[PDB]
Enzyme design. Structure first.
Site: not given
Ligand code: ADP
Ligand code: MG
Length: 301
Positions: A20, A26, A94, A138, A140, A143, A160, A179
């Site tokens: 999230s 997610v 995924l 971003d 880090k 990500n 991300d 961050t």
């Molecule tokens: N393609 C993906 N496959 C699996 N997990 C994901 C994927 N994209 C995001 N997540 C999970 O969800 C979290 C939040 O997604 P993210 O894209 O980082 O959102 P935001 O841009 O709002 O921070 C990520 O830190 C990761 O843990």
């Molecule tokens: Mg994020």
């Protein structure tokens, strides 16, 4: 731009939460027509311009437009986009193997040679992005993920794209975001931004990978930001005693205040720590090791 208007539930079965963000959840999902698995990222629309409880359409469209363009083994791809009254829903490739650092922290040891094999994949993904004038903004450890952690050579996937921007010639981009411990001085100081910030972030990632210490993390946000701005970091002997000179030089050329003097992605790929020029260089890298005791501690944080 209008995205798909059907109920995403008509085409996918949704599963458990993968993660999230501030305005996003997610979830794992299964495409009904193919039986293939994806990650569904539900982004809350702000809906009214005066609301702070969601993401602006401009920022959602930007993320979507960048993800649509990208096709490379080391970055996630966009499969489909849906929208309803409250949410824009991104069906993403995924990535199931968790964060890179968590996988690495399960190992008994890791040489710099072995470390560079992973880092190289990050460099390749960023090389791709920068070649299209896309700044991720971003980068880090959280990500940097793995497609599947249970293979002999796990593949890195950069995720991300919530802060990513196309660097457009002719129009300066300045903003404070991201961050504190991972952002470049130009982000901190609200100065002109470009592809260079990502390179700084890679220096920070590499520093942590080898040492298990964060180079600029202070005791407060304000202090972290001052460390970044002052480029106040050290290779503390407690953490870096077994780190090669080539690795420190790689880092030193990335943690550079002036963006114009910082190593570019293309130069990072030719750096002798990444691409040794002789036997002696290859030997140092192989001989040197990650600080695993300390690294394991970082990953636990
Ligand atoms: N393609 C993906 N496959 C699996 N997990 C994901 C994927 N994209 C995001 N997540 C999970 O969800 C979290 C939040 O997604 P993210 O894209 O980082 O959102 P935001 O841009 O709002 O921070 C990520 O830190 C990761 O843990
Ligand atoms: Mg994020």
């Amino acid at each position: 731009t209008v995205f798909r208007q059907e109920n995403v539930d008509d085409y996918y079965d949704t599963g458990e939460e993968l993660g999230s963000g501030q305005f996003a959840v997610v979830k794992k999902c299964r495409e009904k027509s193919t039986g293939l698995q994806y990650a569904a990222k539900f982004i809350k629309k702000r809906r009214t311009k005066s609301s702070r409880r969601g993401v602006s359409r401009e920022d959602i469209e930007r993320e979507v437009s960048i993800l649509k363009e990208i096709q490379h083994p080391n970055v996630i791809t966009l499969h489909e986009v849906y929208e309803n009254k409250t949410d824009v829903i991104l069906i993403l490739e995924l990535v199931a193997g968790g964060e890179l650092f968590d996988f690495l922290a399960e190992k008994e040891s890791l040489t710099e040679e072995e470390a560079t094999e992973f880092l190289k994949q990050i460099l390749n993904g960023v090389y791709y992005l920068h070649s299209l004038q896309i700044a991720h903004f971003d980068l880090k450890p959280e990500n940097i993920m793995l497609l599947d952690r249970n293979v002999p050579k796990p593949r890195i996937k950069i995720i991300d794209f919530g802060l990513a921007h196309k660097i457009d010639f002719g129009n300066e981009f300045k903003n404070i975001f991201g961050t504190p411990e991972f952002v470049a001085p130009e982000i901190v100081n609200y100065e002109p931004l470009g592809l260079e910030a990502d390179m700084w972030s890679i220096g920070v990632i590499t520093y942590i990978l080898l040492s298990g210490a964060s180079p600029f993390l202070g005791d407060t946000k304000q202090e972290t930001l001052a460390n970044v701005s002052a480029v106040n970091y050290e290779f503390e002997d407690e953490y870096f005693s077994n780190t090669s000179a080539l690795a420190k030089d790689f880092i030193r050329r990335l943690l550079v205040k002036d963006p114009k003097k910082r190593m570019t992605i293309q130069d990072s790929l030719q750096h002798p720590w990444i691409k040794p020029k002789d036997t002696q260089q290859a030997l140092s890298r192989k001989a040197s090791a990650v600080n695993m005791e300390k690294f394991k501690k970082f990953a636990a944080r």
